[PDB]
Amino acid sequence: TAYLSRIQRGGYIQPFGCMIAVDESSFRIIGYSENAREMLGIMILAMGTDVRSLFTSSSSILLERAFVAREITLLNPVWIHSKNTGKPFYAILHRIDVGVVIDLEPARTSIAGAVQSQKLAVRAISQLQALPGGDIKLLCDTVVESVRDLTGYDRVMVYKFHEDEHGEVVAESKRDDLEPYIGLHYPATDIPQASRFLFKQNRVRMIVDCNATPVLVVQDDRLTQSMCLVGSTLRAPHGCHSQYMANMGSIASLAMAVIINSMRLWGLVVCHHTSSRCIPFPLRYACEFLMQAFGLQLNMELQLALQMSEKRVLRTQTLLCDMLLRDSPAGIVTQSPSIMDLVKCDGAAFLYHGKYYPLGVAPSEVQIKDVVEWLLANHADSTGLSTDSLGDAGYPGAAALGDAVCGMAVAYITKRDFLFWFRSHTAKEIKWGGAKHHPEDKDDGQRMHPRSSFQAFLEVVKSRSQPWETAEMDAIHSLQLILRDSFKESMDKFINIQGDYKAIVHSPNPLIPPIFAADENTCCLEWNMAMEKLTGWSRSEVIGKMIVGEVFGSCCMLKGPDALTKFMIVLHNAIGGQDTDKFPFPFFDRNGKFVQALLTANKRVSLEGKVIGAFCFLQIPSPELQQALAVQRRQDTECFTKAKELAYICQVIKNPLSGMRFANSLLEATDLNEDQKQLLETSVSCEKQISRIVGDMDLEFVLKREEFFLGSVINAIVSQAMFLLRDRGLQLIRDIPEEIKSIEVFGDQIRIQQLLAEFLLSIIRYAPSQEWVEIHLSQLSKQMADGFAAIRTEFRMACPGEGLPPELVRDMFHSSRWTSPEGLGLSVCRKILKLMNGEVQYIRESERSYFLIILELPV
Amino acid sequence: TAYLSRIQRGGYIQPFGCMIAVDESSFRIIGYSENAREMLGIMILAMGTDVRSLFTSSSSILLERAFVAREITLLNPVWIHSKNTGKPFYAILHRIDVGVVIDLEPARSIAGAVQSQKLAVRAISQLQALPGGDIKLLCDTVVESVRDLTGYDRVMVYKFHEDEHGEVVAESKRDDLEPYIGLHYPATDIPQASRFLFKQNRVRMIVDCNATPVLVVQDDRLTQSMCLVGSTLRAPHGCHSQYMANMGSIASLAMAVIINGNSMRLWGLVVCHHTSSRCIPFPLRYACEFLMQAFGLQLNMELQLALQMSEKRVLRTQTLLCDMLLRDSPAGIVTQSPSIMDLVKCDGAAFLYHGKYYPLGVAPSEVQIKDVVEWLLANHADSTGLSTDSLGDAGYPGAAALGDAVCGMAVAYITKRDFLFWFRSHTAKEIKWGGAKHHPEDKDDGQRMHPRSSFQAFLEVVKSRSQPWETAEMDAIHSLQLILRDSFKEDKFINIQGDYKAIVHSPNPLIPPIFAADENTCCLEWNMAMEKLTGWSRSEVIGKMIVGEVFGSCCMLKGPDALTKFMIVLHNAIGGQDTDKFPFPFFDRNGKFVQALLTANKRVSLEGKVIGAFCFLQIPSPELQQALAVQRRQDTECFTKAKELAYICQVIKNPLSGMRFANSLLEATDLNEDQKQLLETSVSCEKQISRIVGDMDLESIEDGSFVLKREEFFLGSVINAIVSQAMFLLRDRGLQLIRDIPEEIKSIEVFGDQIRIQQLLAEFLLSIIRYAPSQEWVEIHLSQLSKQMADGFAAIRTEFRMACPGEGLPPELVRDMFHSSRWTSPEGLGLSVCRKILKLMNGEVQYIRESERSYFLIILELPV
Ligand SMILES: *[C@@H](C)[C@H]1/C(=C/c2[nH]c(/C=C3N=C(/C=C4\NC(=O)C(C=C)=C4C)C(C)=C\3CCC(=O)O)c(CCC(=O)O)c2C)NC(=O)[C@@H]1C
């Protein structure tokens, strides 16, 4: 490991402090520094000098008290008064390989221990803890503000390492006469892995002056090996880091590690001062405690993000069970939870003995035959390819395919049948600082000097998409596995290609849950390989047996006070036509091993023969998601103040919705007035919004994208606010580019007119009475490829007036915080755009109004 | 035990079915009944005979496959035909230690456990969508469920109490009979033998008490009788038969309510009484067994909720105990918001310290308290604390002079004649027994053969008598006296109950593990309970900072982030911010992991605003700390549920304005008036939705009554709205509709809330279509009839009738509809609210079964 020998064993310190290596046994010096002779005033000092008699008697007994401790971190910093000049000195004790070593820093102007120093921190920590969760950026901004108002540095920032080991400055609280560093990515080789393990062990590290001379320590002659000083607050930085800071335009740096707990180094809070800044060790230990609280909240939010990822994998497992209950593989594309909802993507294709099935932005049949022919010639062995960019993969015609179909994930099914997923190009620009990260860059300890340039240069990725993770390829391989199993009714290599690195072959585990299926008598119809492996019982021995009593009562032991009844109530509900999701299922292995599974029993409903049955899977989440699902299953029984009225609305409203859509379905017959026919179409698109809104509900998802005229949305949204402008007199102004016959834009008509309802109505809400209002939309049918087009649409819903209040836009732009009904609705309809390829800004001018950009795709 | 041999080995069956006890190896008849030859119609059944010659060859393989199976219970009941006459049977077969007894009940389908349980499933899901915290609603639901299933005349929940006597906690019966609800019964009515029978055969059916017990025959060489503990066909004990005759119970069906945890304890019985001889088929008895299993599940959930609510109150008394431990004066106990009366629930409290009587609530005068103190010095001097339920049974004269108020007493003795008193006023506990009154000395006599002739509801009042002091409340008192005893410096407890011996004990105290941190986080005060918990002694950890070394270095805290969490929360305790029940999992100096609940609050010296931080630990059972986790995450779940409701109301309101604008702009031209009727049906649905998400919060006495729109309407709108609201589910299920409605084109001036009428009408009619069978008709009958209240105030009476030809809507769902504030499904919930709207709107609804199930509802509105 490059620089590990140099940094740790390099005996050079900074001139602001004095380090004194003394063995605890008899206060005998085994090391010292050159500036100690000046800053102490000692002008007797040698190897063997009793330093207990070099200070006040109070600080003598304090130092020998701080020697004999379990942990010495609590003691730091002991207040030590010197004797040869009388000036008090902070004394940062820490134990090293053979002895301890003090670190004397002069004090300008009483902190006797860690707790007194932490008392400064606790106010900022209390401000940091009382923060809404689910937004790392707000937490980082709170940390940089707290560290700025504590330390008094010019520019503090949160450097965050990525998965590539390269970092990015994700927060800033700079002094405003400087330049912003937010967004600037730095290479991995900029900070060596030796320095990051150094920060894992040391966790706070200041310098005072980079242009200061490195004061060398005097190593003991008897021991050849140099001192392995890691936890010293005084040791000078490497000649490379010192020159680097001289080139950076910041001569004082306080960097402290953001550990996330086994001991992942998430990032670094790096402070920068333009002048030479010192800071007392009580304030430095306060900021180390502030970094402890930062790591605390950050781990509390990364665990929540990983639990949301596990919930998303559980949804993917339910989707694969949906795909298992389909009569043909052609049904997958035809039906509504299709192959483009399995994976976050933009198109999806299925080739099934010809008659190619495209969804969204997918190549035509000739183009996909070119893709298939490239997949047969190259990557012949590997069943799955997950290329970030087709151009990097080597497929000819990638330029002809365009940026729209740049990313492609394929899965091979038998008999030359292929499953495809397609992704459009992501317009991400990385403002690299000095040097772009090179994935071939290893740690080069023979490099003397760092680059002098730090002008950030934007690097734009030309024709590549979002990366394909292991989870999405896991889902793709699982669905490919079930489709090949269906093929047998009537080994797998996967190549991952990304722009930064090169083609790697990885075998992905399937994501199929353990599945059994029973008929009305609870006799086994199905018991798949996953369930066979989990329980240990083979399918053949348990097929035909009674699931409710035999197989799970004796054969595969259940667990609980009375669990079998809980099982027998559940499966009889499945046969009876009631489905339970994520019912807890603690059962034992054949070999006596506990499994804390989550049973889901769905009715095996079919056509008018074999009407009802049971299909069940056994999702096994981590025990923190067992807890996270128990804390919401122990909470629907308590919110009976409003869950009764929610189920009351969600059941009673269904009947006049069916009457509305049956009157409107029978009213489509013979209405030859095309103005009235379009008006009825507006009513059908209005009734549908209520049925989609009530039926889908809100739980923040799935988008039922279909072909629709875009002018059929404005006409379906001018009629919602038209009562609110007919009574408040807002004579509206429209100027459209006639997006009637702007056909086939791919998306939700319903969720788009719901977000435009909650934005337009909020705009017309806060207008002056008997006025006007402007709506306007500028479309540009930008061609993206040979045959692929996209229509980018702004929405200028412009109103002159007082406008929405300043707090309600932060209500809208929250993550989980709300105080108003209208604000809640605004927040949800903003998150609807955050789920669907667009965003929304609120601008404040002489007219207070909403910009709204949605990118939709004419097939 | 008493009667166990007589019941288990009493070779007597009931005559409603025959019984053959075959072998387990080669199908020989080890035993049989006298009425086997008459039931099978044989008029060969003898010693050691092959049993499969009696039944049909096709039925024979069912018996053999039942024998091969490891669990005989699942196959039961195997439908078995007869070879000599062609008669069906239910051959319920169970395994005994010396063979396999097969019980033949003549059938008049179901061949297994699953088919039987399918009947129970609807009632089981009825009592599982029920709100927790109560037991009366649960036991009042299960009796209607069993009355719907069994059909017995009177079904009641006979809950056992702690001294083995039982009372009818909930009873459902037809309105002809005597109400048994509240009636306590002596513990000798149900012997320990019967309880141990119910713990291994949980459904017992007596077809006829009067009917003679048919004798068994046995070919077994060994001298023992057949085993009939598990057999459904076992004759009741003669005493129990006489008992049933003397109660008016001709037939009975007693079902065990076994609750168990991880220890099966029989909670109570669901005895079903019939005023005539009745037998229900074994599908229904096995269904009722499964329903009793679900009932035991719901009772287990209610008992665990009660246990953790008691333990939450235990932690609340510990919090109040430390609140009364940090006081400068001993007299602060009497006068503060968390008073001594708050510690242990009581009518009054009294603290005697160096005389100077400190009364609270209802308390006896100083002379009276001095006299009772003199009595407590004269008797029970040796024991410190006394908690007499009644002072009259304690032995104290002048209890009548004290009156009802000072009857119940709880005493804590502190040194140098210092006392703590809690007083409870006389609670009028009047428990009407049935027949005899239970005494705790009454044992189950093994040779008694005749029950009591009487079962009349005679009262039994109590004396000057209070609510019983519990173990936990006396424990709270015990901890309070110990902490006050230590506070002054800075064991036998007698409990007297009016029905029991004066029990002498000493309970485990509730002083929580306490450490007190100063401003520099150094443990000033260290409790003996911390020394019991972590093992660290006080005089070794003294003078050491807690956050870093006493906790982190000495005790192994959680590795990822417990040390940072503890340091932040203790420095916030020193910063004035008190925190309650922080999750604090840690290890000890022995090494055993111990999760806890750190509560850290600021300590005040009364001259310094926040000098020091006080702390105390509570250690719960893991269900309680998980319930505190769900108490914390209620702030995320319940507000997101309310957020879902408010979001739904607003975002639904927007296209309702779009809907009414589209349907008030569609009024240009509708050429055929059928198109205008479809349009007006859509307008009615839109107004219906705008009223469903209007200003109502689902109470019907504050919102549905205060907001009730009153406008004129025309009834063809309502009828075509109902048909349009129903046609999608009609065409989904392939049904017919036969709307036998007269002409109401001319009744334009009927004046009532039409939108609520079409809401309730569609809810009723779509429940009918939801439970109408596949591919048949549904009838909509109306009969508009005149009704007169005045010459100009004339009303109307329309009777909506909805009929379907089949099994129809299940009885559980109508029970949910008429229960009022109880619902199982959201469909039954909407039916319940649409029933309450008809109750509010001068009408009434019925569900009538006349071999084709029909829905009947009337309503009254006045034309103008
Ligand atoms: C006479 C010897 C004593 C006696 C004996 C006895 N009792 C049983 C079984 C039961 N007794 C029950 C009592 C009740 N029945 C009710 O309806 C109510 C209240 C509403 C009560 C309190 C019940 C119940 C049973 C369970 C059996 C059943 O079918 O219900 C037995 C065992 C009989 C058997 O073979 O199963 C015996 C020996 N009971 C008496 O009261 C006198 C003191």
Ligand SMILES: *[C@H](C)[C@H]1/C(=C/c2[nH]c(/C=C3N=C(/C=C4\NC(=O)C(C=C)=C4C)C(C)=C\3CCC(=O)O)c(CCC(=O)O)c2C)NC(=O)[C@@H]1C
């Ligand atoms: C030498 C050829 C290479 C080198 C060596 C090097 N760097 C460190 C430690 C740090 N480097 C940091 C880089 C940044 N400083 C910033 O302000 C930003 C972004 C805004 C970045 C990316 C940081 C931070 C550290 C930690 C602070 C610290 O003092 O450690 C070290 C370890 C030195 C030590 O102190 O022991 C070394 C050997 N860096 C280079 O860029 C060249 C290629």
